[PDB]
Amino acid sequence: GNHRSFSDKNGLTS
Structure with missing residues (x-):
C-alpha cells in the first residue's frame, strides 16, 4: 500500500 485507495x-444518479 503506497498509492492505493480504500475510499x-x-x-446522485438517475
Missing part, C-alpha cells in the same frame, strides 16, 4: 464516493 468510495457516492452522489
